Amino acid sequence: AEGIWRAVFDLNARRLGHALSLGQSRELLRSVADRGIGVELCPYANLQIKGFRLDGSAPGPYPLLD
Amino acid sequence: IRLGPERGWPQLRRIAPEQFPLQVVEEKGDERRVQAEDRAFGTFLQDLLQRASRIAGAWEMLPELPFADLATWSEGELAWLREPLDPRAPADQRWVAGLPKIELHCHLGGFATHGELLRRVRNAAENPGKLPPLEEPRLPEGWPLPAQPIPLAEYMKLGNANGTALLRDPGCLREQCRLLYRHLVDQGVCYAEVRCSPANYAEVRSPWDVLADIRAAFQECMEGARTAPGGLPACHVNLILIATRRASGDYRAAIARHLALAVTAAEHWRDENACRVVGVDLAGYEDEKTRAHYFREEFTAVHRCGLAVTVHAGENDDAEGIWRAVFDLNARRLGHALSLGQSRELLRSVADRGIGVELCPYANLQIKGFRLDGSAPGPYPLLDYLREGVRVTVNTDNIGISAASLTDNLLLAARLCPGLTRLDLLHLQRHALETAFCTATQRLTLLRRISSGIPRP
Amino acid sequence: LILIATRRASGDYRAAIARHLALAVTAAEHWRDENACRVVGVDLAGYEDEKTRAHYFREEFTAVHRCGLAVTVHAGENDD
Amino acid sequence: NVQAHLFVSLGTAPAIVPEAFLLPGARFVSVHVLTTERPDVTLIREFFRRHAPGVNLTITRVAGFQDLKSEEDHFRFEE
Ligand SMILES: [Zn+2]
């Protein structure tokens, strides 16, 4: 999440791509939610690169619902 | 002859007979004579169908309405909503006074500086012997609408009877908080954020104690007034701590003290339905040497801990200070950004990023001077900001020093920019709702409360 | 009392450092009786290496230096 | 399978409620009749007593409506 924090607060980014580790820092997630910064996810690419469980069967759970 | 089935209206399909009962005059076996006390159900049905018809009539341009309940208005009222506001008509004054309001720029130390309020605050001290001798600075002629502008030094000196000279006594501070809350409730405000400098009032007590006393006083005031539906306080108050910057002297240790205190207090109190510290403010003397990018390493901790930041910028500076505040300090709101129109790219950036702007008509008129009734500082930029898409709001700044309220501020805003409409006032209220520092649930509740509280013509 | 700011090899640790520094400043301002328990400084301990040296935390301790609070540092245990 | 209540209004001509009770396909229960002060309901009562015991007929009258001259009594009838 350090890279995400630096992108948000040092480069003034308006959208974030593949921010899969945003949930590690609660304060940064709260800030992103409050400021309205967009997050972009690519299900197939994330599954093929990081690996993710299907049908609820260790990367962890996929953070879309959270 | 079978005509067919029917569906009916959803809120009349089941209903209840206890609400509209029948009265039995006399009854024999399986035969009755009945009577109705009044015609309540007729009015119920008539206004239900009228509301449905009006909603059907106004279904398009519903995304463009600031609030949904405006779709239940008739054609004549909707046409009246688009006409320019007339500050001199008593009806418009009453309509503005009746609106629910949201306040975002209000200093605690500049509320009771003259008149009976100062005396009431003074006659609450725990140690009357230590009270400074009573004196009231003399206001310029025609003070609420002065003929000539005055610099910031005299404006700040105009409130010397209250503030740091009076708020060291706990009783005076507590009475100040109660009176401010009473005034806010009387004005019809439903949500407000109050700025304060607790460390300025600490001489034998710690700043933590002063802030705790202020928060406790506001919380008790909120507890007392459980009017409004759902058992919620009539007005909700949140806190913002001020970091003051000065031309010369010792002022930079106090800034760090306020930021550390704000972070600790924000982490301390976390109940959603209670008074909380929700941000920090960078205010005071502004010039080239004290621009926002010289305090970045002090605000890095606030950015790490996740607090919102608002910056005083553009009052006595060009657009460079605004740019530095926006891009180097990561500010979420801007105060007195009167020079934003000098740069088109900065205006586009502010509009696109959703950064809020807060204006105080009376203070701006008193300090810079502006033409009234459309008769050099230039035109007042409210209409330009509305047309360009900026999230702009109208506030009061110092109530006591400027001797005006939020209703007077809105009316004077109408006077400064001829052609301003009432739909523009509703848009301003919506902008203040969308820019406020609060949770999503509180925002939704405030939206629902404001939508169903706008008075009819 | 002295309050610790812990640095780690990887993860989320800077927010905790800022939290601890702010809490230390506020607590040192709160209790001031000479003949009583008091907070008298801050510490920079935890994982140390080339990338986590002292000069990477100057902007966080500028506030501590403004408020006039003592500082102690864990250094030299596993570094030149 | 539903209870299928019937609601009917009656004028000065009886033998309409007995007719409407015989809907080809409905098993009516608890027939309700709304009428004014003047008209007679003996025929309906005798019909439901002799041809349909378990239907618990009920009859309702409007207290002060026997003839209409102005619009006032129509509104009370509607309410
Ligand atoms: Zn201000």
Automatic annotation (TrEMBL), chain A:
- The protein's name is adenosine deaminase
**Family (UniProt):** Belongs to the metallo-dependent hydrolases superfamily. Adenosine and AMP deaminases family.
Source organism (scientific name): Limisphaera ngatamarikiensis
UniProtKB/TrEMBL annotation, chain D:
- Of which family is this protein a member? Belongs to the metallo-dependent hydrolases superfamily. Adenosine and AMP deaminases family.
User: What name is this protein filed under?
Assistant: adenosine deaminase
User: Covered range within the whole protein?
Assistant: 2 to 80 of 629
